[PDB]
C-alpha cells in the first residue's frame, strides 16, 4: 500500500519508542524503590526529565535539516539513545551515573525525534493522497512501540531487575539501528540537502560538543529542579515579552496556552495516575492479575484502536476544544470513581481507569496530533522555540501538580490515599472543564482570525 521506505521508518520508529517508553513506564517507581526518593521528589524529578526530553526536540530538526542531514542525524540520535539506555542500566552498578544517563536519553531524543517524520514526508511526491494515511500509521507505530513497552517493561523489571529492563531498551535501539542500516538502500535519494554532500566534520564536532555540554546541563537540572523551575520561569516571561513586542500569531499564543494545559494533564500518566492505580485500584481485570504500573499502557492501546477510526471521521479550534473536554472528563471520571464507586477497603474497579485513559487518549488524538500542524498553518523558528519551551514548562508544572497526590512511604491504608487522589483529580477536572468552556467561547473569534 505504501512505498518501501515507509516500512523501514515505521519499524525504526516503533523500536525507538519502545526503548523510550520502557524507561518512562518504570521511571517514577525506579526513583521511589531503587533510589529511595519520596513520591514528591520522584514526581518533580520525572517532571524535569520529561521537560528536557520534550524541550530538546527543537534541536534535532535543525541538526537534521541544516548541519548533518536527516539520515545522518537519525543514526547519531539512535546511537546516543542506545548509549543512554545502556548507561541507565549501568547506573545500577554506579548509582551516581543516573542523572548523566537520563541526560543522555534526553539529548539523544532531542537529536532523533523530529527526523523520522521529516524523512517520511520525503518518501512521497508532494501532493500524494496517501500522506495522511501514512502519517496516521506513523502515529500508530509510535503507540504500538509504546504499548509493548508500557505493558512489558514493569513485568520485566519486577521479574529480572532494572538493569535487564534498561539494557533491553538499549537493545531495542540497537535493532532500530540495524533495521535502518539493512534498509539504507531504500532511502538513497531521500534526505535533506546536507545528506547528499560529504559530512562536515566541523559541524559534526560542534554537534558532539554541544550534545555533551547539554547532557551535563540536563543532569544538573534534573538534580536541582528548584533552579530548572526558575530557568524556565525567566525564559518563559522573557520569550513572552519578545513575542508580545513583535494577529494570526495571537491565535497561535492562545492555542499554545491550551496545549500547555493539555501537557500538564498528560504528564500525570506516569506519576499521579500511575500511583493512583498502584494504591487505589484492583490489580485484576478479566480474571488476570497484572502489574498496576502496566495500566499506563492503556493510553497507547486506546490511541492504536482510535486513530484509524478518527482518521475515518469546527476545523482547528473546535477540535482543540473537543480534546480539552475529553481530558476534563478523564479526570472527572477518576475523581468520581474514587468518590462514589470504591470498595469498603478503598479500592476501585480497573474499568474506571480503562475509561479514564480512553478519555485522555481521545483528548490526545484531538489536541497533540493536530497542534503544531496547524500552528504551522498560522505562521517562525522563534515560535517553534517558544513552543518547545512552553511545553517543557508544562511538563515541569505537571510534576509539580502531581506532588499534591504524593503519599508518604509509611501510609498503608487505601482509605487514607483515596481522598487525596479524588480531591486533586476532581480539581484538575473542574479547572480543565472551565478552560474547555472558555475555549468553546473563543472558537468563533479564533476561527475568524484564522481566515
Amino acid at each position, epitope marked *: 500500500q505504501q512505498p518501501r521506505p515507509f516500512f523501514m521508518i515505521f519499524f525504526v520508529e516503533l523500536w525507538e519508542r519502545f526503548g523510550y517508553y520502557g524507561v518512562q513506564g518504570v521511571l517514577a517507581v525506579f526513583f521511589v*524503590k531503587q533510589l529511595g526518593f519520596s513520591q514528591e521528589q520522584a514526581f518533580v524529578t520525572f517532571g524535569a526529565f520529561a521537560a528536557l526530553v520534550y524541550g530538546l526536540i527543537s534541536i534535532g530538526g535543525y541538526v537534521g535539516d541544516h548541519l548533518l542531514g536527516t539520515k545522518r542525524t537519525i543514526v547519531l540520535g539512535a546511537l546516543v539513545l542506545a548509549i543512554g539506555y545502556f548507561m541507565t542500566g549501568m547506573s545500577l552498578l554506579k548509582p551516581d551515573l543516573i542523572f548523566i544517563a537520563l541526560g543522555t536519553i534526553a539529548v539523544g531524543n532531542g537529536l532523533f525525534k523530529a527526523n523520522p517524520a521529516s524523512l517520511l514526508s520525503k518518501c512521497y511526491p508532494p501532493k500524494d493522497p496517501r500522506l495522511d494515511g501514512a502519517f496516521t500509521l506513523f502515529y500508530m507505530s509510535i503507540n504500538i512501540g509504546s504499548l509493548i513497552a508500557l505493558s512489558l517493561a514493569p513485568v520485566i523489571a519486577d521479574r529480572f531487575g532494572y538493569s535487564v529492563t534498561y539494557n533491553l531498551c538499549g537493545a531495542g535501539l540497537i535493532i532500530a539501528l540495524l533495521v535502518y542500516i539493512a534498509c539504507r538502500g531504500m532511502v538513497k535519494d531521500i534526505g535533506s540537502e546536507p545528506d547528499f554532500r560529504p559530512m562536515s566534520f566541523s559541524k559534526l564536532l560542534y554537534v558532539l560538543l554541544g550534545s555533551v555540554v547539554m547532557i551535563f546541563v540536563c543532569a544538573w537540572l534534573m538534580h536541582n529542579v528548584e533552579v530548572a523551575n526558575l530557568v524556565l520561569i525567566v525564559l518563559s516571561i522573557v520569550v513572552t515579552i519578545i513575542f508580545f513586542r513583535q494577529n494570526k500569531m495571537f491565535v497561535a499564543f492562545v492555542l499554545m496556552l491550551e496545549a500547555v494545559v493539555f501537557y500538564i494533564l498528560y504528564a500525570q500518566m506516569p506519576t499521579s495516575l500511575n500511583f493512583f492505580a498502584i494504591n487505589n485500584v484492583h490489580h485484576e481485570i478479566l480474571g488476570f492479575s497484572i502489574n498496576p504500573v502496566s495500566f499506563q499502557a492503556l493510553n497507547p492501546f486506546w490511541v492504536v484502536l482510535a486513530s484509524p477510526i478518527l482518521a475515518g471521521i469546527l476545523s482547528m479550534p473546535m477540535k482543540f476544544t473537543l480534546g480539552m473536554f475529553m481530558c476534563s472528563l478523564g479526570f472527572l471520571t477518576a475523581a468520581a470513581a474514587g468518590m462514589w464507586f470504591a470498595d469498603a477497603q478503598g479500592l476501585t474497579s480497573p474499568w474506571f481507569i480503562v475509561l479514564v485513559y480512553l478519555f485522555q487518549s481521545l483528548g490526545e488524538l484531538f489536541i497533540s496530533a493536530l497542534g503544531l500542524a496547524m500552528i504551522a498553518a498560522l505562521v517562525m523558528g522563534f515560535i517553534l522555540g517558544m513552543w518547545f519551551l512552553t511545553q517543557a514548562a508544562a511538563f515541569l508544572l505537571g510534576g509539580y501538580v502531581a506532588t499534591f497526590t504524593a503519599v508518604p512511604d509509611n501510609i498503608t491504608d487505601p482509605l487514607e*490515599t483515596l481522598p487525596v487522589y479524588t480531591n486533586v483529580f476532581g480539581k484538575i477536572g473542574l479547572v480543565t472543564l472551565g478552560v474547555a468552556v472558555v475555549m468553546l467561547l473563543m472558537v468563533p473569534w479564533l476561527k475568524r482570525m484564522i481566515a
Partner: nanobody
Amino acid sequence: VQLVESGGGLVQAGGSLRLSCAASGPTLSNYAVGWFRQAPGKEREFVAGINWSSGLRYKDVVKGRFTVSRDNVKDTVYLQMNSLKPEDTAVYYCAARFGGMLPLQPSGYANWGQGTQVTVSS
C-alpha cells in the same frame, strides 16, 4: 507470584512462633505482604503486614504481640508471634500486593501462600 510459607506449628499459650514468606520469580521487594488468618468457622482476616517501603499495619488484637518485618536480602517477610493465646489458632496465609497499600480484605491481594496451621494450646 507464588509465595511459600514456613514456620507454623503447635505451641503453648504465652509462647512464640515465627512465620516466613518467600517468593519465587518476582522479587518480593516490590510487594506489600499481608498476613491473613482463618480460624475454624470464620472468614480470613487481616492480621499484619508490611508494604514495599517499610510501612506497617496491624489488627488491633495483635498489637504489642506480633511484629512483621522484612529481610530484603533473603527476599523474605517474617511474622514474629509472641505472647500467643489459644484464640490465635488459625490457618495463616501470606498474601502479596504490588506497592505501598495493605488493604484489609483478601480481594486486595493477587498472590497467596498455601496456608500454615498455627495452634496455641492452653
